[PDB]
Design a binder for this molecule. Structure first.
Ligand SMILES: Nc1ncnc2c1ncn2[C@@H]1O[C@H](COP(=O)(O)OP(=O)(O)O)[C@@H](O)[C@H]1O
Lengths: 100, 159, 79
């Protein structure tokens, strides 16, 4: 978990297809709709042939999320699961002798 | 020329523009497993009705039947409603109470837990990572239902 | 069970002379066909067995338990 968190932080999952839309404004873009940016984006989407989206899924390279000893030490000496042997002494105390 | 096949009317039919098949596919075509023919025929219907109702003078004349994405969305809502009787299907009958991203501190946790199993909010495939649900707890009558519809319709797709 | 263990190791080290690659005789894991002398398998007890058992077998009734059931007997029916 800590290693995948570190890998996510390092990758940062940012800077994807920046500045896709081109600058195409024109002077006569007035005397009508004031949402011309939305219409231009609509057309830029529409000029595409079809939603291919045949992208290579292996580009992520998720296998690189490897652990390190420093990451290993993120255990931070977690609390014990068993409170104390004192609570369990009798367990073997009765079985110092052979079992019944 | 599937639309045109037997609609023997004066002029053929087409869309020719402006529709976005990804929107139609994603918006509510889930659980419309087949008989999209219903959808497309209802679209043809709305379009043809809007056409023929035109007067002879009318100030303008349409040359051919054209389907628009707005009527198609209307038709898909209608179809989902009329399917509701066949099989129970929630709707969006909510007014003036939606997408309050700043409603509370709880929203951030909701978003940061709904995201990881999904690609577009979080690239990781959640292979070894444990996927989990969300449980809300507290007095009744103070937010347990509207949150669900809001989240479903704003970030998820189906409810 | 001690006899079984003994004969088990016996059979293992015996087939270790024929299953190994230097012998390359049989590796079917069905060696009783190879050890056709079934009499060779005869388990027989020795004082090793009984001695270790007496060492490794506490009485299965506590002094407390025997005392308790003696007390139960003290409810000697009809008196
Ligand atoms: N903080 C809030 N978040 C969401 N909805 C709220 C909130 N406060 C009031 N409401 C409105 O009142 C209702 C709050 O309780 P609700 O979720 O209906 O629980 P119950 O189903 O027990 O009545 C919501 O349906 C919504 O219409």
């Amino acid at each position: 978990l800590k290693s995948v968190h570190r890998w996510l932080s390092a990758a940062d999952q940012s800077e994807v297809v920046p500045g896709n839309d081109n600058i195409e404004y024109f002077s006569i873009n007035e005397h009508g709709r004031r949402e011309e940016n939305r219409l231009r984006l609509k057309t830029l989407l529409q000029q595409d042939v079809v939603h291919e989206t045949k992208t290579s899924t292996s580009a992520a390279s998720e296998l690189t999320a490897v652990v390190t000893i420093n990451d290993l030490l993120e255990a931070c000496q977690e609390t014990k699961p068993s409170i104390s042997t004192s609570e369990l002494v009798k367990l073997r105390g009765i079985y110092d002798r052979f079992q019944k | 020329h599937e639309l045109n096949r037997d609609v023997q009317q004066k002029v053929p039919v087409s869309y020719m523009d402006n529709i976005s098949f990804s929107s139609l596919s994603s918006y509510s075509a889930g659980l419309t497993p087949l008989d999209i023919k219903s959808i497309v025929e209802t679209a043809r219907m709305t379009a043809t009705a809007r056409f023929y109702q035109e007067s002879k003078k009318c100030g303008w004349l349409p040359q051919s039947i054209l389907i628009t994405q707005e009527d198609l969305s209307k038709a898909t809502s209608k179809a989902r409603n009329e399917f509701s009787v066949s099989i129970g299907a929630p709707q969006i009958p909510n007014v003036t109470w939606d997408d309050i991203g700043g409603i509370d501190f709880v929203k951030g946790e909701i978003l940061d837990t709904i995201d990881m199993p999904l690609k577009h909010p979080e690239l990781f495939t959640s292979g070894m990572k444990k996927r989990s649900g969300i449980l809300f707890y507290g007095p009744p009558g103070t937010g347990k239902t509207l949150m669900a519809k809001a989240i479903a319709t704003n970030f998820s797709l189906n409810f | 069970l001690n006899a079984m263990s003994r004969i088990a190791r016996m059979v293992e080290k015996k087939v270790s002379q024929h299953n190994e690659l230097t012998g390359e005789n049989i590796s079917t894991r069905r060696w009783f066909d190879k050890i056709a002398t079934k009499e060779d398998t005869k388990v027989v007890v020795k004082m090793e067995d009984f001695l270790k058992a007496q060492e490794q077998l506490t009485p299965s009734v506590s002094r407390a338990e025997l005392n308790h059931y003696e007390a139960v007997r003290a409810n000697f029916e009809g008196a």
